[PDB]
């Protein structure tokens, strides 16, 4: 119930989700194994990744998109902006996450979070998970477990615009 316990829970849920996805990927008997949008392990992983990145946002409706565009190459920004069925900055935040998984790049992005505390504090409250040094370092360790997993996620998913309530 304490905010420290809440953040710890989110990270434990990310840890368990990475482990289940790793086991799912290793056991896959397809000729070219790949994680897709409809895999339950992917949906659970992204639910919990999204929680960690939305927790403590100063402006929830704009999502983490407005932060991560500072860290993302131009062609990737453009690719997300022209998606036909992703209409809001919150949806663009989630499409960016799918792209980061497709590109096995989440660790590099999270390192840029650590290197840009000024930017982080512009978009997140002091209480936020990514604003806690201990928690952000653990987050980075956790996502390093996705480095050798093939993701083939469709970025143009319309459910990505659905906001919390």
């Amino acid at each position: 119930m304490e905010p420290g316990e809440v953040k710890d829970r989110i990270l434990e849920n990310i840890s368990l989700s990475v482990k289940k996805l790793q086991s799912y990927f290793a056991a896959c008997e397809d000729e070219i194994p790949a994680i897709r949008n409809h895999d339950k392990v992917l949906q659970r992983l992204c639910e919990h990744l999204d929680h960690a990145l939305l927790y403590g946002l100063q402006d929830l409706s704009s999502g983490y998109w407005v932060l991560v565009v500072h860290f993302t190459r131009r062609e990737a920004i453009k690719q997300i902006e022209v998606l036909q069925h992703v209409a809001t900055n919150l949806g663009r935040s989630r499409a960016w996450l799918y792209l980061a998984l497709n590109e096995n790049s989440l660790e590099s992005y999270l390192r840029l979070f650590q290197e840009n505390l000024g930017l982080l504090h512009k978009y997140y409250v002091k209480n936020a998970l990514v604003c806690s040094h201990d928690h952000l370092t653990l987050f980075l360790t956790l996502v390093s477990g996705l480095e050798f997993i093939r993701f083939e996620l469709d970025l143009d998913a319309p459910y990505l615009d659905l906001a919390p309530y």
Partner: protein
């Protein structure tokens, strides 16, 4: 300020991240962390703000190089000029990158880093050993530099700014 983008590629340990640090803050470090994926930094020199995509050079990251080179103003290809055992792999990775059609026409600056070390190759030998003469369909330039001793860091910056 004006703006430009460059991407820094090359084999592991060639000094890419060190180079960014030297032009950002002037600080050389003997101990470094290998870049896992990519780094990005903005550095201002004069009235040009340079956004630098510093890519890891370890084997598993080279598949990423083209992705980060597409559309940029220039590619900097870093070579440890003292590591003779790696030159053959460095030559092959450079020619493989430049064969990618979506990188056609992008100017390339080849940097022979670590010229302070006793066995470092000079610009003339680097040009021959990297077969730079065989590149005739884009602008390509080669400088021998030292991030530790600072030789030719200024002319490197001058070249990058001329391609803003």
């Amino acid at each position: 300020k004006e703006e430009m983008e460059l991407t820094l590629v090359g084999l592991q340990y060639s000094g890419k991240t060190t180079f960014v640090n030297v032009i950002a803050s002037g600080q050389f470090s003997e101990d470094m962390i290998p870049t896992v994926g990519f780094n990005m930094r903005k550095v201002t020199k004069g009235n040009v703000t340079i956004k630098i995509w510093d890519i890891g050079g370890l084997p598993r990251f080279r598949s990423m190089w083209e992705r980060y080179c597409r559309g940029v103003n220039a590619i900097v290809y870093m070579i440890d000029a003292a590591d003779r055992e790696k030159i053959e792999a460095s030559r092959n990775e450079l020619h493989n990158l430049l064969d990618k059609p979506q990188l056609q026409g992008i100017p390339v600056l080849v940097l022979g880093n670590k010229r302070d070390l006793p066995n470092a190759l000079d610009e003339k030998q680097l040009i021959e050993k990297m077969n730079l003469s065989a590149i005739q369909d884009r602008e390509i330039c080669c400088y021998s530099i030292s991030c530790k001793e600072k030789d030719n860091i200024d002319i490197t910056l001058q070249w990058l700014i001329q391609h803003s």
